[PDB]
Design an enzyme around this catalytic site. Structure first.
Site, PDB file in Angstrom:
ATOM      1  CG  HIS A  62      -0.644  -0.292   2.517  1.00  0.00           C
ATOM      2  ND1 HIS A  62      -0.368   0.643   3.492  1.00  0.00           N
ATOM      3  CD2 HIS A  62      -0.496  -1.493   3.100  1.00  0.00           C
ATOM      4  CE1 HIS A  62      -0.049   0.030   4.626  1.00  0.00           C
ATOM      5  NE2 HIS A  62      -0.103  -1.259   4.417  1.00  0.00           N
ATOM      6  CG  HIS A  92       3.854   5.868   5.228  1.00  0.00           C
ATOM      7  ND1 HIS A  92       3.831   5.717   6.600  1.00  0.00           N
ATOM      8  CD2 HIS A  92       2.693   6.463   4.862  1.00  0.00           C
ATOM      9  CE1 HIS A  92       2.654   6.222   7.037  1.00  0.00           C
ATOM     10  NE2 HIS A  92       1.934   6.678   6.001  1.00  0.00           N
ATOM     11  CG  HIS A  94      -0.556   8.537   2.054  1.00  0.00           C
ATOM     12  ND1 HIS A  94      -1.279   7.380   2.206  1.00  0.00           N
ATOM     13  CD2 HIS A  94       0.038   8.795   3.270  1.00  0.00           C
ATOM     14  CE1 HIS A  94      -1.177   6.959   3.470  1.00  0.00           C
ATOM     15  NE2 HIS A  94      -0.371   7.785   4.126  1.00  0.00           N
ATOM     16  CD  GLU A 104      -3.636   9.469   3.558  1.00  0.00           C
ATOM     17  OE1 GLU A 104      -3.078   9.486   4.676  1.00  0.00           O
ATOM     18  OE2 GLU A 104      -4.226   8.448   3.104  1.00  0.00           O
ATOM     19  CG  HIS A 117       1.530  10.417   6.800  1.00  0.00           C
ATOM     20  ND1 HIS A 117       0.438   9.675   6.390  1.00  0.00           N
ATOM     21  CD2 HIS A 117       1.234  11.743   6.680  1.00  0.00           C
ATOM     22  CE1 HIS A 117      -0.499  10.537   6.027  1.00  0.00           C
ATOM     23  NE2 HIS A 117      -0.063  11.790   6.196  1.00  0.00           N
ATOM     24  CB  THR A 196      -4.864   7.951   6.788  1.00  0.00           C
ATOM     25  OG1 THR A 196      -3.585   7.533   6.342  1.00  0.00           O
ATOM     26  CG2 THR A 196      -4.784   9.285   7.549  1.00  0.00           C
ATOM     27  CB  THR A 197      -3.770   2.553   6.335  1.00  0.00           C
ATOM     28  OG1 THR A 197      -2.840   2.725   7.445  1.00  0.00           O
ATOM     29  CG2 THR A 197      -3.233   3.279   5.122  1.00  0.00           C
TER      30      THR A 197
END
Ligand SMILES: [Zn+2]
Length: 258
Positions: A62, A92, A94, A104, A117, A196-197
């Site tokens: 992901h 990581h 996004h 996000e 993040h 957020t996951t």
């Protein structure tokens, strides 16, 4: 198959396995800059990364995580809205399929090309798995990325991505200095939210920096060559691995700056 970011398993489906997805303190959110209130009692943020020990980079299907040794207080976040000491465990990103989307959090509904993040856990709970069960268990430092000039300190990350193209691949990634990913200013917004996951646990104090970093088009293009799939599977580019903004509900976003 499993949650993800596709049409059939994306964010609008997560609530079936993770009902907290419709909870009272979900993330990300839109940051309405005019409504955020300056809080003069917020303390300067303390980002202490000089002894950070990166170990490895992992494509988890992901995103990719740059992992740190969090068995001692080497890289820690303190101050700001936080009580206590939070240890860096991984960072990581996004990002989008196009430069116009990928973050996000949003700022007055603006989407950035990506969002970094840096995830930290509260040492009072002893380990990450216990920290995520607590409302003040994590502190995530969020940094927006816009496309323009290259970020020199990002290049070591982008150059190893070819070696972790597919889910489950990892590579040694020692001696990476995350100070090279920070913007000049540490002005920030903060609010209480969630991962957020999935599992979407409501354990995060979010600290989102106002100043984006700039990365080049070539750098983000290499993010978009990663794969969500495993080796030998049909190629699904790892793009648009962002959750959209969630309802703010009974929360106030505070600003560290005027
Ligand atoms: Zn994240």
């Amino acid at each position: 198959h499993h949650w993800g970011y596709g049409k059939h398993n994306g964010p609008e489906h997560w609530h079936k396995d993770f009902p907290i997805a419709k909870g009272e303190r979900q993330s990300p959110v839109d940051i309405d800059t005019h409504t955020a209130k300056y809080d003069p009692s917020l303390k300067p943020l303390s980002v202490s990364y000089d002894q950070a020990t990166s170990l490895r980079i992992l494509n988890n299907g992901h995103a990719f995580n740059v992992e740190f040794d969090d068995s001692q207080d080497k890289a820690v976040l303190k101050g700001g809205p936080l009580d206590g000491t939070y240890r860096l465990i991984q960072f990581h990103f996004h990002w989008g399929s196009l430069d116009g989307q990928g973050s996000e959090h949003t700022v007055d509904k603006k989407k950035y090309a990506a969002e970094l993040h840096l995830v930290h856990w509260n040492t009072k709970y002893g380990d990450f798995g216990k920290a995520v069960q607590q409302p003040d268990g994590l502190a995530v430092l969020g940094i927006f990325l816009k496309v323009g000039s290259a970020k020199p300190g990002l290049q070591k990350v982008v150059d190893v991505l070819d070696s972790i193209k597919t889910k489950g691949k990892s590579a040694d990634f020692t001696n990476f200095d995350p100070r090279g990913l920070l913007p000049e200013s540490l002005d920030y917004w903060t609010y209480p939210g969630s991962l957020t996951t999935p599992p979407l646990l409501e354990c995060v104090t979010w600290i989102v920096l106002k100043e984006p970093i700039s990365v080049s088009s070539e750098q983000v293009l290499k993010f978009r060559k990663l794969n969500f799939n495993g080796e030998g599977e049909p190629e699904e580019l790892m793009v648009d691995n962002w959750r959209p903004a969630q309802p703010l509900k009974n929360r106030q976003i505070k600003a560290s700056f005027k």
